[PDB]
Scaffold this active site. Structure first.
Site, PDB file in Angstrom:
ATOM      1  N   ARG A 193      47.932  58.600  44.351  1.00  0.00           N
ATOM      2  CA  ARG A 193      49.348  58.517  43.995  1.00  0.00           C
ATOM      3  C   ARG A 193      49.657  58.762  42.523  1.00  0.00           C
ATOM      4  NH1 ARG A 193      51.015  52.899  46.044  1.00  0.00           N
ATOM      5  NH2 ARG A 193      48.762  52.498  46.247  1.00  0.00           N
ATOM      6  N   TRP A 251      45.045  67.508  48.334  1.00  0.00           N
ATOM      7  CA  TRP A 251      43.691  68.026  48.310  1.00  0.00           C
ATOM      8  C   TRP A 251      42.753  66.863  48.625  1.00  0.00           C
ATOM      9  CZ3 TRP A 251      46.833  68.257  43.875  1.00  0.00           C
ATOM     10  CH2 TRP A 251      46.619  67.227  42.954  1.00  0.00           C
ATOM     11  N   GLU A 311      36.029  61.959  51.939  1.00  0.00           N
ATOM     12  CA  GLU A 311      36.787  62.099  53.178  1.00  0.00           C
ATOM     13  C   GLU A 311      36.160  63.120  54.111  1.00  0.00           C
ATOM     14  OE1 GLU A 311      41.283  61.987  52.659  1.00  0.00           O
ATOM     15  OE2 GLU A 311      40.693  62.867  50.738  1.00  0.00           O
ATOM     16  N   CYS A 326      47.046  54.953  49.694  1.00  0.00           N
ATOM     17  CA  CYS A 326      46.716  56.256  49.126  1.00  0.00           C
ATOM     18  C   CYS A 326      46.248  56.098  47.682  1.00  0.00           C
ATOM     19  CB  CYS A 326      47.916  57.210  49.183  1.00  0.00           C
ATOM     20  SG  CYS A 326      47.566  58.761  48.337  1.00  0.00           S
TER      21      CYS A 326
END
Ligand code: HEM
Ligand code: HEM
Ligand code: OUS
Ligand code: OUS
Ligand code: OUS
Ligand code: H4B
Ligand code: ZN
Lengths: 413, 408
Positions: free
Chosen positions: B110, B279, B284, B107
């Site tokens: 973070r 969000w 993506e 991720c």
């Protein structure tokens, strides 16, 4: 280790089965609890170390020509063993040298261009004894490989390591590169990647033209002696001026690149023998020039200028002005090479070929070691077929390996 | 031993000591690296895991070996004895949920890890209750476009026959319809789940942006369908700042990414339903959700309307179109004041986050294969950043799809 390992392609659903990893001979740097797959880099062999390494290679060679266990195989083993016994080393046959060099490329997990591995022209320079002779061999390599723009992959192999005090080395990282000059005010003229090597050449006596695109001299070390400077004859250096099919102003940036990528600072390892000078060359993937050589911050760093001349808003990063200019530069690089009929491959075609190649290797060889971090191109990753392809990375021999930079280790005479 | 990681652009070197604290395996060995493979209890097992997690919790609030720490250890000990499991305190649930995010090596977002709103739903017993908890999550996290990270945690696994599961892969996703003539209407990533919803009674509108129903499984029972009230589903029409024809493509997307099919693990306890949301990073949507071969695949049409030569790949028409689609996504979200981050800003923040973690924590596990964005990789600062990947717990984990295990 488990005997079958599966890799899946998440776009096509194809599953392949790898058994070749069981032949892995060298460490990756990973452990069971940590993965170092994004780490860039994660005295000679004794008699006793060399025996098993040579037998391993000789066995592999005779298996490949479908003569395993034969009289010629057993005789070769005995003759190699006697050589190691009496001289602490051995010499490869020409056939073995050629096989070993082609398979070091076939085994190079970071190389996307390996579909071509068996069409490598091998030049045997093990009779070389002086830097001038190295210069002759290198000029012949450059001319053959360039082929007036119809580039041909090739390798030139200089004598192997003996005691480590008589090494052959090309001090250049590639045979053809542009100089970089740190100015007193902190800026850089030319290629910032090459500032340190440029400074070494200048100390060694080179008179620098001090331009943006000065081909560096060769710095050649034969038989452990101090290295010597040679200017490559400029008619052997094929270059392409960079222009854009649409933007007429792009030529006014005055950019050009050289046609022949020839890496000269790696070590070729075959059957435990160490070839510390083994320059090899292919042709470019466009992004190697257009993304890295031009847009990397510690490189030519002209994203800004192209963005300006494209009149993009450079205040918000979310306008993606960097991404837009990056595509345009890479369009120009591919257009300029194709227009001048100098072999080049775009990242879509190269990655498509590598998938076909990987599939064939899994079929015929039982696997294909591949380093996803390096195989996936530095732009538009997910719209290439390698992005969704799982890969296994492992180290087979023969192999190309890293070695320390020679100025850190050389004993000056 | 200590491990160094170098940024080849800034020549900054960091030193990792945190990896020495991991005990889960990565899948690699000394001889083979699986860094690009996507997927490489009992009371006997349970107490050491609990003990490890309690210790790190009381070490985190700097009361290691305190009176409270000693008593909580014995408390947990007695509870595993007499019930074969244990229950986390609220403070521990919050700590564990934030650290599962902090430890998510894949991720890039973070830097936000300690700003997470934790909804305790461990008192839930039915799919209707799950629906209510999920609606509250969606409304809170959406916040009219000013998105807020959140997680909702449903009861933990007991015997494996009474799992709570959200069958959807995300709380909000569009349906995909396998056409007779071959191709696909809607979202091709969701074709199978869409058919499972139809097979369960869902009347599909058979449009292009049909919000799927929630399929919710409580306490091992058969899943039940629910329609998220539409005023809860924030959406953004995709248009382009310079190409006026872009709006005519008819595209939109939803504002809230809420992954609902993963498993949260804290001190040996497994939470099989734990939807969590943040969000979007623009790529993506603009890269993966729209341009993958097994997704919307509009790339071809955009390049058409841009009048690009599409006969040869070396014109990079695919690359030009991809940049323009991603420009439009960011422009559309920002014009509607819906939270979104571009891949340049997100990776910048991640490098800053890594620096923070190496300083105050001795490292940051990070998966370069997932951290580097799916476009323009090398002109982002994560591309040149060496990363070490290793598995710390609490964590988010993969789990099998429920329709491959559940006995009806
Ligand atoms: C024939 C056309 C070739 C193409 C298109 C090609 C393409 C590439 C690319 C794009 C990379 C990564 C470059 C980067 O990181 O920016 C690479 C790496 C590499 N190539 Fe190939 N290559 C070719 C030929 C060859 C040949 C002929 C050899 C050796 C005989 C070779 C050996 C290697 C090795 C060892 C690496 C890895 C470098 C490292 O580990 O640091 N390649 N290649
Ligand atoms: C706040 C804004 C966030 C952003 C911008 C963000 C961004 C991303 C991106 C871009 C990915 C990779 C997705 C892909 O390309 O397939 C990812 C993965 C992931 N994110 Fe974050 N994320 C955010 C918040 C969160 C939160 C709140 C959680 C959990 C509480 C979380 C947990 C994860 C996990 C576990 C993964 C890895 C999934 C896997 O291993 O398969 N993220 N994130
Ligand atoms: C024959 C050939 C053709 C081609 N088309 N491309 C090629 C690219 C490489 C290559 C790329 C990156 C490298 O870089 C590693 C590195 C860079 C900076 C710092 N540490 C380590 C090296 C190692 N010389 C070789 C090598 C050979 C290539
Ligand atoms: C909170 C959050 C915010 C955001 N902005 N983005 C996010 C993306 C993911 C994510 C991305 C890819 C994934 O895919 C792995 C996969 C897919 C299919 C099969 N196996 C494995 C999954 C897991 N569902 C989650 C998860 C959470 C995200
Ligand atoms: C090597 C790699 C790196 C990365 N950084 N990311 C990756 C994402 C996917 C990926 C996997 C599954 C997907 O789709 C879900 C799915 C479910 C069931 C069967 N197939 C597919 C998608 C589409 N987003 C992407 C695959 C490989 C990836
Ligand atoms: C830190 C990171 O591993 C490093 O920048 C690597 C990543 N992947 C790469 N991939 C290629 N092809 N070339 C590179 O130079 C790099 N650099
Ligand atoms: Zn690994």
């Amino acid at each position: 280790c488990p005997r079958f390992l599966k890799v899946k392609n998440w776009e096509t659903e194809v599953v392949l089965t790898d058994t070749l990893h069981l032949k892995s001979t060298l460490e990756t740097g990973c452990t069971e609890y940590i993965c170092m797959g994004s780490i860039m880099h994660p005295d000679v062999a004794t008699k006793d170390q060399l025996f098993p390494l040579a037998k391993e290679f000789i066995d592999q060679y005779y298996s490949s020509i479908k003569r395993f266990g034969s009289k010629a195989h057993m005789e070769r083993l005995e003759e190699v063993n006697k050589e190691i016994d009496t001289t602490s080393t051995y010499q490869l046959k020409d056939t073995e040298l050629i096989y070993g060099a082609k398979h070091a490329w076939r085994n190079a997990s970071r190389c996307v261009g390996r579909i071509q591995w068996s069409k490598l022209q091998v030049f045997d320079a093990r009779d070389c004894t002086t830097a001038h002779g190295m210069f002759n061999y290198i000029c012949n390599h450059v001319k053959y490989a360039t082929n007036k723009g119809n580039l041909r992959s090739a390798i030139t192999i200089f004598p192997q390591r003996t005691d480590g005090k008589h090494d052959f080395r090309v001090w250049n990282s590639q045979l053809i590169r542009y100089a970089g000059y740190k100015q007193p005010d902190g800026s850089t003229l030319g290629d910032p990647a090459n500032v340190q090597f440029t400074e070494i050449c200048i100390q060694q006596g080179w008179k620098p033209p001090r331009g943006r695109f000065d081909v560096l001299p060769l710095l050649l070390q034969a038989n452990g002696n101090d290295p010597e400077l040679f200017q490559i004859p400029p008619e052997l250096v094929l270059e392409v001026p960079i222009r854009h099919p649409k933007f007429e102003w792009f030529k006014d940036l005055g950019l050009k690149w050289y046609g022949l990528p020839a890496v000269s600072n790696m070590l070729l390892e075959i059957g435990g023998l160490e070839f510390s000078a083994c320059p090899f060359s292919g042709w470019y993937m466009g992004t190697e020039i257009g993304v890295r050589d031009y847009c990397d911050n510690s490189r030519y760093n002209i994203l800004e200028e192209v963005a300006k001349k494209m009149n993009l808003d450079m205040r918000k990063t979310s306008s993606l002005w960097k991404d837009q200019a990056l595509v345009e530069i890479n369009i120009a690089v591919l257009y300029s090479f194709q227009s001048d009929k100098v072999t080049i491959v775009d990242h879509h075609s190269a990655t498509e070929s590598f998938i076909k190649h990987m599939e064939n290797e899994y079929r015929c060889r039982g696997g294909c070691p591949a380093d996803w971090v390096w195989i996936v191109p530095p732009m538009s990753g997910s719209i290439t077929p390698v992005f969704h392809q799982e890969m296994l990375n492992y180290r087979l021999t023969p192999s190309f390996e890293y070695q320390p930079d020679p100025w850190n280790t050389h004993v000056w005479k």
